Amino acid sequence: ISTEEQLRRLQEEKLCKICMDRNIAIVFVPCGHLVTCKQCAEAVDKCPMCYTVITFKQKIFMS
Amino acid sequence: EISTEEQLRRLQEEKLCKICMDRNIAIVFVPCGHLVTCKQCAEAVDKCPMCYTVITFKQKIFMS
Ligand SMILES: [Zn+2]
Ligand SMILES: [Zn+2]
Ligand SMILES: [Zn+2]
Ligand SMILES: [Zn+2]
């Protein structure tokens, strides 16, 4: 796996898994999935990865 | 103008726990939202090390 591809993969890991445009911003409580931006998280009542009901949408901060 | 090797090393460093700098970040603090500790180090803090907000709950994260 090339260095350019490893870098591209870590950069993609930071992206919202729905829009792949905005960065991840929300952790779902209680399942813990960290897979959406704030906009893409609005419409979901169940986690689109594991289908656990979302009790709370916690905004994340890296700094 | 940063080399590919250095850009990769920097993104990898960004995933490290800010207390141990060994294990990866795995916990988000509720309510402040800071994502700065691994599971083990989160057990040592009662306040967020970034903003000093009292931590009400330590939520495990999953990227996949
Ligand atoms: Zn999105
Ligand atoms: Zn989930
Ligand atoms: Zn740690
Ligand atoms: Zn904080």
Residue numbers in the entry:
A (entry chain B): 435 to 497
B (entry chain A): 434 to 497
What do the paper's sentences say?
We report the development of three ubiquitin variants (UbVs), each binding selectively to the RING or U-box domain of a distinct E3 ligase: monomeric UBE4B, phosphorylated active CBL, or dimeric XIAP. With ∼600 members, the RING/U-box E3s form the largest family. This family uses a RING or U-box domain to recruit E2 enzymes thioesterified with Ub (E2∼Ub) and facilitates transfer of Ub directly to substrate. RING/U-box domains promote Ub transfer by shifting the equilibrium of E2∼Ub into a closed conformation (Dou et al., 2012b, Plechanovová et al., 2012, Pruneda et al., 2012). We generated selective UbVs for each RING/U-box domain and used biochemical assays and structural studies to identify two types of UbVs: competitive inhibitors of E2∼Ub binding sites on UBE4B or phosphorylated CBL and an activator of XIAP.
We determined the crystal structure of XR bound to UbV.XRD to 1.57 Å but were unable to obtain crystals of an XR-UbV.XRM complex. XR adopts a dimeric RING domain arrangement similar to structures of BIRC3 and BIRC7 in which the C-terminal tail of each subunit interacts with the second subunit (Dou et al., 2012b, Mace et al., 2008). UbV.XRD forms a symmetrical domain-swapped dimer in which β1 is flipped 180° away from the β sheet of its own subunit and is replaced by β1′ from the other subunit. In the complex, the UbV dimer forms a groove that cradles the RING dimer, covering a surface area of 816 Å2 that is remote from the E2∼Ub binding site. The groove is formed by the β2-β1′-β1-β2′ β sheet that comprises the UbV dimer interface. Two symmetrical hydrophobic pockets at the base of the groove bind the two Phe490 residues from the XR dimer. Symmetrical salt bridges between UbV.XRD Glu46 side chains (Ala46 in Ub) and XR Lys472 side chains also appear to stabilize the complex. UbV.XRD did not stimulate UbcH5B S22R∼Ub discharge catalyzed by XR T489E or XR F490R, even though both variants were comparably active to wild-type XR in promoting UbcH5B S22R∼Ub discharge in the presence of Ub74. Given this relatively small surface area, it is noteworthy that UbV.XR activates E3 activity through binding to a region on XIAP that has not previously been reported to be involved in protein-protein interactions. Our data suggest that UbV.XR stimulates XIAP-mediated Ub transfer by binding the RING domain and stabilizing donor Ub in a conformation primed for catalysis.
